[PDB]
């Protein structure tokens, strides 16, 4: 029963700087050569969008300034350099085994 | 890699009851080469109304083989309960040169429903399921029978109307009774005839879905199906491997009524298959509607010299295992 | 924040919003389109302001199988209809603690194994 922890809760960043969000799982989410960790971006009043799947793969239409990385229990999403359109809330979820769980979420604001 | 459909949403696996004693039965059906039992028709040539000496891969004369049998599962009234299987998953055998399989042998006769030894019923044909690979080891709690890296699975589905062959990594799941969870005894496949085999709508995915409850399928390189015509005729299945891939043989598509095996597929499997096990199946019947399912027999192939007797239409209907006894060797030497 | 334009092939369209009394039940739908309905599991997610996303459970439309997280084994009941390509979640014994936006999403199978597509959410409010 894996539990996700996200850090920080919120963070404000200047245009062109870097944002780093961390996710830690209570138990490894690694099997078969994959890391079953995904990142969703959610803007207000809209549902979540998939950004990154299986730890580091960008979904189509997602610019390369998003970099996902990590393995086992510790993962980070980096946004560099941040644009005004990146103000959202970011959530991590694992799919290693049922039941699936998400993180608390990290709210990113821009100046 | 290939898309093989949805993962299971089930949080646990159906509980599986292993009782080898209910499956320890001596129903002998040994190889009889004078009826061309288990003969793979020689590849690359054709023959007719003639007798040749040939060196190929054959089961030997009088081999009893290994017998396997699938059973209905536990039921109470009209409620299917635990599955009922033999101790096959832990019994990992050596692939060597391959094997041939006598399928549906005892059909139409009457026999036991296994799970209730006193109850008897008309025996129906059932197709065997296999797991083949290059690396075996333990499950987390010590039990043998776990296949590592890519594994070849041969899994009949659609209430015996289809054969699915796929080659993927098998990721064990973690729920209660699953191979990576608590109270693991054995993995199994199953289907439920009340919901899965109503006429006109055979569920072509019912056995796969049950497999998908014990293992997640990952990094799958192919998944083929092979339609099978529904009847109750004795048939033979064979499997071998060369540098060109794994070869599947059946009597069913060319010589349905004689049993000569012909190649019907070459699977792109290039790692050497060193091990195999039989995947236990259990049928989720209700108590009143249990059936008897014909045991199948698996015989190993070895390099042997045989006399092959080709009929006029080109089929092999009699043979001689030269190394069987002194009399058979006399027949062999008398053709040289 | 209404970032639309045109439409995509795959869509999950959840039913409208709800206001109900404590003790009631509510049954919301998720209508899928653009893909083979029975080869993709539908997952349900609860989103309330001070907990983020909470996974409820999921259903396999091919044989009606379901899974729930412990906190919801009883509150929620998941069902599907093949003919209409619809998934349903029914919530019973409603308290104020259930006021939330609820989402259905599709699990993409290979590759990704992620929630590739989400419905737009159903707002459920439980007024005392
Ligand atoms: C019951 O079990 C069977 C297993 O036998 C499961 O079968 C799965 O089912 C999936 C159905 O959803 C299917 O996934 C789709 O496959 C197509 C590709 O076409 C395939 O056609 C054959 C099946 O009839 C395959 O066998 C073909 O295989 C290839 O590889 C095999 C190796 O085995 C060879 O046999 C063969 O020679 C060939 O080399 C062939 O692959 C995909 O197009 C489809 O992809 C979709 O994914 C996303 C949709 O959610 C989407 O992002 C994709 O991009 C599309 O975007 C638009 C939609 O948004 C499209 O309109 C665009 O055109 C763009 O392509 C795309 O939509 C998807 O992966 C599996 O292929 C199939 N597998 C097999 C082996 O049959 C059933 O699911 C099970 N049923 C239940 C119920 O459980
Ligand atoms: C299915 O078939 C398999 C393989 O044929 C069969 O495997 C057997 O499992 C038993 C245990 O379930 C093994 O028993 C061991 O025997 C040795 C010899 O004495 C012992 O050293 C082992 O006992 C240790 O562990 C115990 C606690 O777990 C201690 O209490 C004990 O004192 C020992 O420290 C253990 O008893 C047996 O070796 C294998 N056999 C083979 C050939 O591998 C399996 O049991 C079958 N399953 C079913 C359900 O029929
Ligand atoms: C179980 O019983 C069934 C039913 O009687 C047996 O199937 C029958 O098998 C025979 C020969 O194996 C088939 O005869 C064939 O007829 C064809 C077509 O008309 C003919 O061209 C052939 O020369 C051949 O003799 C018959 O079709 C078949 N019956 C059915 C309904 O398919 C089956 O063999 C029995 N199985 C066992 C293990 O005893
Ligand atoms: C299963 O398939 C994927 C290939 O798509 C493998 O993932 C790759 O792993 C290597 C190193 O392990 C990385 O360098 C690649 O970037 C990965 N590619 C991805 C994730 O798309 C994975 O290793 C395979 N697993 C096994 C056991 O073979
Ligand atoms: C394999 O078997 C089934 C026949 O039972 C075939 O699938 C059916 O195809 C017909 C039309 O050809 C449809 O009316 C049925 O609804 C299909 N059944 C399904 C989809 O479950 C299938 O065509 C056969 N395939 C081959 C290659 O022989
Ligand atoms: C088969 O062979 C035998 C002897 O080898 C011969 O008498 C017979 O005519 C042959 N039949 C055919 C159809 O060639
Ligand atoms: C093999 O058995 C031992 C005995 O407990 C176990 O520690 C080990 O993990 C097993 N193998 C695997 C791959 O789990
Ligand atoms: C397959 O796994 C086994 C044991 O896990 C190992 O011996 C082997 O190195 C693996 N395959 C390859 C190609 O390395």
């Amino acid at each position: 029963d894996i539990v996700m922890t996200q850090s920080p809760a919120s963070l404000t960043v200047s245009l062109g700087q870097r944002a780093t969000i961390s996710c830690r799982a209570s138990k490894s989410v690694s099997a078969s050569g994959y890391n079953y960790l995904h990142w969703y971006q959610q803007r207000p009043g809209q549902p979540p969008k998939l950004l990154i799947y299986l730890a580091f793969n960008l979904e189509s239409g997602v610019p390369a300034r998003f970099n996902g990385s990590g393995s086992g229990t510790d993962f980070t999403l980096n946004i560099h350099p941040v644009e005004e359109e990146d103000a959202a809330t970011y959530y991590c979820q694992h799919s290693r085994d049922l039941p699936f769980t998400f993180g608390s979420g990290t709210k990113l604001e821009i100046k | 890699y290939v898309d093989v459909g949805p993962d299971s949403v089930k949080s646990a696996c159906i509980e599986v009851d292993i009782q080898q004693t209910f499956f320890d039965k001596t129903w002998p059906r040994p190889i009889d080469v004078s009826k061309a039992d288990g003969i793979i028709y020689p590849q690359g040539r054709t023959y007719s109304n003639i007798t040749i000496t040939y060196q190929g891969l054959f089961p030997y004369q009088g081999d009893h083989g290994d017998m396997y049998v699938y059973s209905a599962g536990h039921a109470t009234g009209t409620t299917p309960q635990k599955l009922f299987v033999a101790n096959y998953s832990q019994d990992v055998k050596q692939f060597a040169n391959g094997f041939v399989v006598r399928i549906g042998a005892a059909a139409n006769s009457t026999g036991t429903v296994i799970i209730s030894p006193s109850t008897s019923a008309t025996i129906r044909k059932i197709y065997p399921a296999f797991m083949l690979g290059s690396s075996v080891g333990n499950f987390s709690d010590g039990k043998m029978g776990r296949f590592f890296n890519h594994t070849l699975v041969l899994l009949p589905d659609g209430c015996g109307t289809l054969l699915r062959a796929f080659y993927c990594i098998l990721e064990p799941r973690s729920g209660n009774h699953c191979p990576a969870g608590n109270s693991y005894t054995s993995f199994a496949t199953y289907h439920t005839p009340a919901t899965d085999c109503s006429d006109g709508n055979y569920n072509r995915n019912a056995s796969l879905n049950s497999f998908k409850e014990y293992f997640n399928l990952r990094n799958c390189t192919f998944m083929y199906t092979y339609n099978i015509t529904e009847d109750e005729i004795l048939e033979w299945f064979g499997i071998t491997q060369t540098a060109q891939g794994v070869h599947l043989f059946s009597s069913r598509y060319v010589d349905l009524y004689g049993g000569n095996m012909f190649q019907f597929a070459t699977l792109p499997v290039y790692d050497t298959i060193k091990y195999y096990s039989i995947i236990p199946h259990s049928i989720r019947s209700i108590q009143s509607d249990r059936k008897a399912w014909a045991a199948f027999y698996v015989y190993k192939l070895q390099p042997l010299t045989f006399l092959l007797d080709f009929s006029v239409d080109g089929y092999i209907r009699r043979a001689i295992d030269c190394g069987f006894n002194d009399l058979s060797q006399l027949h062999c030497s008398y053709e040289s | 924040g209404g970032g639309s334009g045109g439409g995509s092939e795959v869509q999950l369209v959840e039913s409208g919003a709800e206001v109900v009394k404590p003790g009631a039940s509510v049954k919301m739908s998720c209508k899928a389109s653009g893909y083979p309905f029975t080869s993709y599991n539908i997952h349900w997610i609860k989103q309330t302001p001070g907990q983020g996303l909470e996974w409820i459970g999921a259903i396999y439309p091919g044989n009606g199988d379901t899974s729930y997280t412990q906190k919801f084994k009883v509150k929620a009941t998941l069902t599907s209809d093949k003919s209409s390509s619809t998934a349903y979640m029914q919530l019973s014994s409603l308290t104020s603690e259930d006021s939330a936006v609820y989402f259905c999403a599709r699990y993409g199978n290979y590759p990704s194994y992620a929630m590739d597509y989400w419905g737009q959410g159903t707002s459920v409010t439980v007024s005392s």
Side-chain angles (χ1 to χ4, degrees), chain B residues 138-140 142 148:
Chain B
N138 323 321
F139 289 103
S140 87
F148 293 99

Side-chain angles (χ1 to χ4, degrees), chain B residues 17-21 86-92 143-144 185:
Chain B
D17 184 24
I18 318 178
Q19 310 277 321
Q20 183 64 19
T21 179
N87 196 15
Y88 297 153
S89 299
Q90 308 206 27
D91 185 15
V92 167
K143 300 198 174 55
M144 284 315 276
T185 57

